[PDB]
Design a protein around this ligand. Structure first.
Ligand SMILES: CO[C@H]1[C@H](O)[C@@H](O)[C@@H](O[C@H]2[C@H](O[C@@H]3CO[C@@H](O)[C@H](O)[C@H]3O)OC[C@@H](O[C@@H]3OC[C@@H](O)[C@H](O)[C@H]3O)[C@@H]2O)O[C@@H]1C(=O)O
Length: 383
């Protein structure tokens, strides 16, 4: 069916696509694995964001450096997340089972975070962004710390000026609950220090967040994975990564960051090879490069077809489509306010890994016909 695209109607900036560097909790990534994940060529994922954890014990920060430094050299932006303050700062004097940061210690906590950022910078892995807390709404039996929306507002008002050019992220709610960040967004003296409203997708689905969007904050989805008991090469499961990416982009998210990059259910399997989940990610990340603008495009042109479109700073128009029908699906493209002459097709499916599948001419009226393979994530790139 018909897909209308208008290159002159723009939505969010895309910062990029990322994953978690897990060293300290799991084995570090290798040099080759970082090249596979952070290159953007054939067979590479195209990640441009790396997340790292801030250990409450500063004697363990060194272990983060080899992977973060290599990612920065490959053009990636590093964001850092703390799971807990040092225990002594907290109401429970424990790293685990939640506990609150004592207000008496807000200045000491800011010094902890900034010490981490200084260590990273001095050692050749400067941070792009830093978060104040992982999942303030979750109190599990591992590193954690409970915060309310009103605590984030107080903290940012008294501490936010110390962060400088670091892009500050709040609140990394487990389910992207606006209650955690609305008090900050409604006060200009807290909100001015914030660059990114970050959130996770556990137990939920992507949704727009207008107050954040209208305040000029980028929305970042800073952590998720799907069914961790599946192999990352199971296609029935991997295609739903595609569904979640499309929904994230439709929800105006500027970034999407997976959990552990290498894992049985990750973007690279333990053999270092790109997984079906990784290839799906790459249908977006190899082609929709940092600084791209999402544009207007018929999102659901026919049952079980979902799509988004973009323009990259170099002019490549890109369309990314998820086909959850078990049949070939035709699209009739009608593009306005562009100068596209042809699209190249690349698909991932049960049998294909970002494989080139043909070219379609785009006529002077902006019309083309393209086809989507059964059960596929397909990218069309203007060239
Ligand atoms: C297959 O096991 C998976 C689990 O299914 C995952 O949930 C994940 O577990 C790890 C957990 O990850 C949290 C996932 O939910 C988010 O809300 C949260 O932000 C994530 O942090 O993190 C803690 C980790 O346990 C630590 O492991 C290292 C050990 O030294 C520490 O003492 C533990 O606290 C937990 O494994 O990932 C699992 C996996 O093995 O991949």
């Amino acid at each position: 069916d018909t897909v209308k695209i208008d290159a002159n109607v723009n939505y969010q900036i895309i910062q990029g696509f990322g994953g978690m560097s897990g060293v300290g909790w799991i084995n570090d990534l290798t040099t080759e694995q970082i090249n596979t994940a952070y290159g953007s060529g054939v067979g590479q994922i195209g990640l441009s964001i790396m997340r790292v954890r801030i250990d409450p014990d500063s004697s363990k920060w060194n272990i983060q450096l080899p992977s973060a430094r290599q990612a920065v050299s490959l053009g990636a932006k590093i964001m850092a997340t703390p799971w807990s303050p040092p225990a002594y700062m907290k109401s429970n004097n424990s790293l685990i089972n939640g506990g609150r940061l004592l207000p008496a210690n807000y200045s000491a906590y800011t010094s902890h975070l900034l010490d981490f950022s200084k260590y990273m910078q001095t050692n050749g892995a400067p941070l792009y962004a830093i978060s104040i807390q992982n999942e303030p709404d979750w109190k599990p039996d591992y590193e954690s710390c409970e915060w309310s929306g009103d605590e984030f507002k107080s903290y940012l008002k008294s501490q936010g000026s110390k962060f400088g050019s670091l892009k500050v992220i709040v609140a990394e709610s487990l389910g992207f609950n606006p209650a955690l960040t609305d008090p900050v967004l409604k006060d200009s003296d807290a909100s001015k220090y914030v660059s990114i409203i970050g959130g996770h997708l556990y137990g939920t689905t992507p949704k727009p967040y207008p107050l954040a969007q209208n305040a000029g904050k980028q929305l970042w989805m800073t952590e998720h994975y799907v069914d961790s008991k599946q192999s990352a090469n199971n296609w029935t499961s991997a295609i739903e990564v595609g569904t979640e990416l499309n929904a994230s982009m439709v929800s105006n998210y500027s970034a999407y960051v997976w959990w552990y990059i290498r894992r049985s259910y990750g973007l690279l399997t333990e053999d270092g090879k790109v997984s079906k989940r990784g290839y799906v990610m790459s249908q977006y990340a190899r082609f929709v490069r940092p600084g791209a603008l999402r544009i207007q495009a018929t999102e659901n042109p026919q049952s079980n077809v979902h799509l988004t479109a973009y323009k990259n700073t170099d002019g490549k128009m890109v369309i990314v489509a998820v086909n959850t029908n078990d049949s070939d699906q035709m699209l009739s493209l009608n593009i306005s306010n562009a100068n596209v002459t042809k699209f190249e097709k690349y698909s991932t499916s049960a049998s294909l890994n970002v494989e080139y599948g043909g070219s379609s001419q785009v006529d002077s009226s902006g019309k083309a016909t393209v086809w989507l393979n059964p059960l596929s994530v397909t990218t069309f790139v203007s060239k």
